[PDB]
Structure formats: structure tokens, C-alpha cells
Amino acid sequence: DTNQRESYLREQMKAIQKELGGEDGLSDLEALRKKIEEVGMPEAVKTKALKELDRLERMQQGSPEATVARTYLDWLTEVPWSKADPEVLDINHTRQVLDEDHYGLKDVKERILEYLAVRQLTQGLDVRNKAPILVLVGPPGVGKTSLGRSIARSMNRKFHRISLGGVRDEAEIRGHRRTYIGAMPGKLIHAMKQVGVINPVILLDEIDKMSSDWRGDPASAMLEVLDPEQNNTFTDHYLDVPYDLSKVFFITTANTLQTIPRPLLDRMEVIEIPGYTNMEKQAIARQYLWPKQVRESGMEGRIEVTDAAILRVISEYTREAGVRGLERELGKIARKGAKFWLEGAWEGLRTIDASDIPTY
Amino acid sequence: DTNQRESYLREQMKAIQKELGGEDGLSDLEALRKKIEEVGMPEAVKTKALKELDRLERMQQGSPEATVARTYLDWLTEVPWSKADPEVLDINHTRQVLDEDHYGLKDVKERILEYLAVRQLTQGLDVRNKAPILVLVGPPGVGKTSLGRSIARSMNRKFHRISLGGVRDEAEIRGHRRTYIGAMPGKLIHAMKQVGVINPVILLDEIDKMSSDWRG
Amino acid sequence: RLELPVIPLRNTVILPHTTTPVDVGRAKSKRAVEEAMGADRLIFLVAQRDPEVDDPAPDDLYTWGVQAVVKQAMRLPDGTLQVMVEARARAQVTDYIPGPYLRARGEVFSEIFPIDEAVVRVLVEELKEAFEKYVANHKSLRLDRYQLEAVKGTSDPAMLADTIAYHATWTVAEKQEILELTDLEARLKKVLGLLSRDLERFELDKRVAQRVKEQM
Amino acid sequence: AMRLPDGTLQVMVEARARAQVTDYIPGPYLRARGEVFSEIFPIDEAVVRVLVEELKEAFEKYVANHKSLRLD
Ligand SMILES: Nc1ncnc2c1ncn2[C@@H]1O[C@H](COP(=O)(O)OP(=O)(O)OP(O)(O)=S)[C@@H](O)[C@H]1O
């Protein structure tokens, strides 16, 4: 009875197939095979998938190798295959966006609007480009990230970003070959995993801030994803089949010309980003900075500052080149305005002149 | 019909699980199924629990898929869902609380006034932040966590402490997918399973004493 | 009727207009049997709860008492007085008079015939076909053929309704909810829904039965 | 008409026609002005008869859609 009744219990724990509950997953990784089939994948990916799915269903318990194999299966299926985005095939919308939201960027938006125009002149939107991918160089916090977000909004494809600065090896740009629980791909595969389409607008953060010493040089991997003739055959260390990276746009950022590595310095379009002047940041603070401090700290129509006091702030509370320091000062003004308003609203609309600034 | 047929699955397989040769599940798949579909928690819990049914009906001893079904089920259920403490929204209350709990330098008190006075203006038909998160810097000996529990008591919220000087990877704060026990979930969901409401104050201790020892 | 003797029913409520056996094993019910043969063969049958206390209680009864005209009453020397009762209709129980033997007064029959009887006859024919399908399919789960034979050739809709509701096997709470429903169509809708639920768990039994041969 | 024993005036009437109130005489009791009849007789009775038959079929469907919400 101990053998036969337990065998019939095995018959029950498979033969119920969880019924209504089993409808989802179809008995543990039938639905993952279904989702291999559902996602339109390259054929080498599908052969690797079906092969290592046959490496699965092998008594998962007592085998964390089957756990990391199902993990690899998830990455394979979750990675977006044949899922695109609508684009904009005009340069006019990018003109209206970067004339609209970001205060012209003083002249250099047109040097961007030539690059996007040249990119949309390339016929068929073909894989070969032999072309640069628009590096941005400039002192920190000058709108470059929101510049890329704007360019993707004009593109009407979703922006993304990954702070790749400070990484010491290739082992999390390519991942590593699977051997245990906790096996992980590169950061780029994480990035395009949390982007559910196969043609995003990817913005690199700190290529010049990469570090090298041990566990393989990631500069090979950035070079391998760098060239449009090369990123189409970018393969992994976690994954196997080379991934197609032609449709994926790569805006990149940096901070220093002279510490980006030599294979990543050639074939690149250098844009030296400027920093809005005092009065230009005054104009910025008047319409897109202090209004957002007002709109996020919840004080619309309940406070105001004179712009000579904004001159007093920029001349006295922020000597950084960018706007993040001025953003922090205007945040502190927003917070002390919230306190001095929640002390009892003495006015229906406050008045911040240049006098009481070391009181707010 | 789906719920009653799954209840028929509950009834048949609770009659089945009593004599299992798979014993580390302890026949508690249907015992904890009372909060799979007789649950007063949202359709995230319902859909997760429907997949837990697919994660039941499995054996044990070494990497069990059904023990991790019930451990995951408890983790989802024990973690509060749409359960909230009544939090008092007052700032002068905190002026008394920080007067009754500390001697005070009377300087940082103004800073938490700044932040909480912003917190009084949480608008937009919800509570959305886009705001700083109060880094506290200074000696360890100074009553920082005392200040935090003062703020938590001032807000009628459950103070906790999980420290991040002791995490080296995204496996002590991130999880692993529920297919084996011996995967143990992270610190914030540890502290959130500790609390019975979905809204605690959490103070973080010594963020600067963290390192990337292993890959990641 | 009023102040008639009360016999607690054995393990299930006896629905009207079905030839059923009623066991009388306890002496406290035997005294009310001896009283009920002094009431012109008419018994106000009030059922007790599913855990049958050995003596009838003035708090464990049900709120519906059925009046039964005794076709014949045979006595047996084994200790059980099996009585052949053919009941008429449910009636409400106002309150409980303690015994033993128990007494409970009622009123006129709660079965009513409302307007729009064409819909009533359509529902009777639909429920007759659905119960014929339920009886013909449930040969594996032991549904009898005399139960299907005893529901053919009925004059009142209450005849077929209560007889079919007795001839299908489910719990006591659903039968109590049926006897609460004095409407002529709501009882038919309830029986149709319960038959659909039983046929769907029956389908669930064949689903697990296919995956029996699959996964063997 | 007749008088109910509980203190209610019960009257069985059939309405004649619609009218428009021009001026309101103050009350109580209330007074109304208007016309003796302002109804419109059917013209082009083929479409009217088609509409009557369609309304009859739609009302038959409406009363036939009830299963536990019975109507007279
Ligand atoms: N033309 C502009 N130049 C600089 N900052 C701007 C400009 N337009 C808007 N901003 C503000 O810039 C802030 C966010 O961007 P920044 O701090 O300038 O830089 P970032 O894009 O966040 O990071 P970078 O520039 O890539 S290092 C917001 O508060 C915007 O209001």
C-alpha cells in the first residue's frame, strides 16, 4: 500500500493537472513552450529554446541546474522578439518639440536635427549605416538626459537610460555563462528587458566612466554593441545566439572627450553641450523649473518669487554650471514656502521679494 | 463556476493530501488555499494564487516546487494588501512629539518640518512624491533611529528597522522565482510581511557601509 | 397545521410530494407519532439540523415545517417506526414550543401560483429536460432511474419542482434556501443552477480522468 | 368614483388630451388653463401601422425576456 498508494498519489498530483489552476502554465512549462512559439523569434534562438526546454522537464526538484535553465528560458522568452514601435518619419515634429519644451538649447538643437534628418534619409531604414550614433559631451546636469527623452518623444518611441558608469568588467555587460542560481546577463539585456519593444531609443549614460582591471574588458562589449554593422551580431555570455540591434537607437552621453576608450572614440558624432547662461537659466527657472517646484510641492497659485530674487538665487545659491543646483535651491524655497504657508496662510497668494531670502 | 470547480479541486485534493508520500508540503496546500480563492485580497492575489495551484501538486526533499508554492502563498497573503493604518496628518503634533522624545538641536526639526509641510501638500487625486528621501548623516551614537521612531509615532505608523550595511547582492534584497525552497526573499518584503498594513515608515541604517563584493 | 406534533427528520429535509421513507427511532419522536395518529393522519414535519442530537431540542429545529398526509403507516419491532408520508407543501414555523415531545404551529401552505404561468410551464419543461440529462449522464455517480420515473406525469408545477429537487443529491443548506423560496420560478432557477454546477464538476471529474491516462 | 373606507377618494378615469398651461391661478385649490384638445391624428397610416406592429413585437420580446422578473 505504501508503494502503490503513493504511486496513485503521483497519479493524482499529475492527473488533476491543477485543472482550472493548471489551465495557466499547463503543468509547469508547457505555457513557456507556448510562449516560445508565440513570440516571433529568430530560428537559432528557437532551436536553442526547444533544445534546452528538452533539457527541462527533467525532475526540477533536486536540480538547481534545471532552475537556472528555466531562468534562461524565461530570459529567452521575456526578451522582446518582433515587437516594434511606431515612429515619426519627419524632422518637423522634433523641431516643434525641441523648440517647445527645452528652450531651444541655444543653437545646438539644429545640430541634432541634422543627425535625426540624416538618419531618416537612410533608405529602407536598413541595417548598414556606417554612421555615428550621436554622443553628447558636457558638464553634468545640463538637460542632456531630458534632451534624449525629448528626442524620443519626438520619435514617439520610448526613451530608456542605463547608468553604465562605474562598471569594472565585462561580466555584467555580457553576463556570464550559466553555472548556478543567480546567473545574470549584462545590464543592456536588463535594459531592453524592461523595454517591451525591439526598437527602443536607448541613451548610454557614462561610457567614459567605465573601469577596467579584472574579469574581462567590457570595452569589447561596448564596441560590439557600438557599431551598427556589429551590434546586429551581438551575442552574450548569458545568452547564446547573437542579438539583432539594428532597429535599436543608441543616443549616448559622457562627460569627458579624453577618457572614452579609443575603439569607442572613432565613428562617433561629437556634440559639445553648452550650459544656459545666468539669464538663460533665469528664463528656465521662470517657466520650466520653479513652476515644476510649485507643481510637485503642491502650491499652484499660492506662491511667487520676483525674478530679481531668482537672479539673487543663481548669483548666490548655485555656482554649478548646470541647473541641478538651482533645482535644489528652488526645491528648498518650495519646502520653506510649504512650511511658512502651513504655519497659517497669511496671504491667498504669497510674495517673495529679494529681501527675505535668508528667511525662506 | 471557476471558483466552485476550483473549490471542488480544493475538496478532492484536501481529501487526497492527507496521506501524501510528499510530506514536507505537510498537506498544507489546501490548508493554505483558504486564502487562495476564499481570499478577501485583490485580483493580483487571485491570479497569483491561480498560478499557485499550478505550483501545487508537486513533491519535495531538496528543491520542492510545492513547498515554495505554500511559502510564496504565505508571503503574498501575509504581506498586507489594501490594508492601511489610519495615519494622522498633523505637523504641530510632530512639534510636540519631537519636543517630548528628544532634547534636540532644534535645527533638524525645521528640516523635517520642511519635508512634512511638503507632505501636507500631496495632491493630484493621489499621493505621488518626486521629492527627496531624507538622508541622515552623523555619528552612529546620536539618536537617529530615535528621531525616526518619533516621526513614525507622530504619524501613527509602524516603525521598523532593516539595515543595509549587511546586503552584498540583489538576492538578500531581491528574490528568487518561486520554484525551490531555500530561495529566501529580501529585506523589504521581510519587513513588509512583518507589518500588517501596507504603509510603514522605514528608516534605512548606514547606506554608505555597503559594497559590491560579488557579481552585481 | 397548528399545534400538530413535530417529528425531526432524518439527516435531510424531506421535500413535499415525494414518496419518501421517514425513520422514527427515538422514543421522543415515537410519542409525537402516537399523538400524530390522533391528528387525522396529518403531521407538521419540522426537521432538525444535520448533527442529530439524540433527543429533539427546541432550538435545533428548522424554520419551515411541512404538512404531510400519511398514505400508510407500518410499525416495525426493530426499534424504528418507518412511516410512509406523502407531504403537501411547506409552511412557516412561528416559534418553538419545548418538549419532549416538541410542538410547533404553522399556517396555510406557502406554495403559491403567481401570474405569467406560460413562463412557469416553459421553466418546468426546461428543468424537466435538464434533470433528465442530469439523470442520464450521472450513471457513474449513482443517479437512479425510479427517481426519473416518479417525476413524469405531474399536474402541479410544485409536484415536479419539489420531486426533482429531492431526487438530486446536494447539501441541506441549498435545500433550506429552496424551501425559503416560496416563488414558483425562483426555486426552478435555483435547481437549474445547482444542476449546472453538478454537471460542471462532473465535467471536471472527466477532465482529471483524461489526464489520468495522459500522465500514467 | 367612490369613497374608500380608509379616507381615500378613488376614481377611475381615462385621459382625454394634452394641453399647455398659460397662466397659473394662485391656490389652494390649484387651477389650470389650456385647450380642450391638442392631440394630433394619424396621417399616412401605413408607416404608423408598421410602427405599431414593430412596437408590438418589441414589447412581446421585452415581456419574453423575463425569467424571474415576471410581468402580467
Ligand atoms: N535647456 C535646459 N538646460 C538645462 N536644464 C534644463 C533645460 N531645460 C530644462 N532643464 C531642466 O533640467 C532639469 C533636469 O535636467 P538636468 O538636471 O539639466 O540634466 P539631466 O538631463 O537631468 O542630466 P544630464 O544633463 O544628462 S547630466 C529639469 O529640472 C529641467 O527643468
Residue numbers in the entry:
A (entry chain B): 218 to 577
B (entry chain C): 218 to 433
C (entry chain F): 2 to 217
D (entry chain C): 74 to 145
Publication passage describing the model:
To study the structure in the substrate-free state with ATPγS, we first set out to identify MtaLon with a point mutation in the N-terminal LH domain to eliminate substrate binding while preserving the native sequence of the AAA+ and the protease domains. Using a fluorescence polarization (FP) assay, we found that MtaLon-Y224S, which carries a mutation of the entry-gate residue Tyr224 to Ser19, does not interact with fluorescein isothiocyanate (FITC)-labeled casein. We conducted cryo-EM analysis on MtaLon-Y224S incubated with 5 mM of ATPγS (MtaLon-Y224S:ATPγS). Unexpectedly, both MtaLon-Y224S:ATPγS and wild-type MtaLon, whether with ADP or lacking nucleotide, predominantly formed left-handed spiral pentamers or spiral hexamers, rather than closed-ring hexamers. The substrate-free hexameric form also adopts a left-handed spiral structure. It is composed of the tethered pentamer and an additional Ac-protomer, Ac6*, which binds next to the protomer Ob1 and occupies the lowermost position of the spiral. Interestingly, the 3H subdomain of Ac6* occupies the axial cavity of the spiral complex and binds to the ATPase domains of the protomers 1–5, effectively blocking the accessibility of the pore loops and forming an inactive structure. In the absence of substrate, the sixth protomer binds to the pentamer, occupying the lowest position of the spiral oligomer, resulting in the formation of an auto-inhibited spiral hexamer.
The Lon protease is a AAA+ protein found in prokaryotes, archaea, and eukaryotic organelles. Lon is involved in cellular protein homeostasis by degrading damaged or misfolded abnormal proteins, which prevents these unwanted protein species from forming toxic aggregates. Lon is known to form a homohexamer; each protomer is composed of multiple domains, including an N-terminal substrate-binding globular domain (NGD), a long-helix domain (LH), a three-helix bundle (3H), a AAA+ ATPase module, and a protease domain. We show here, using cryo-electron microscopy (cryo-EM), that the activation process of the Lon AAA+ protease may involve a pentameric assembly and a substrate-dependent incorporation of the sixth protomer to form the substrate-pore-loop contacts seen in the translocating state.
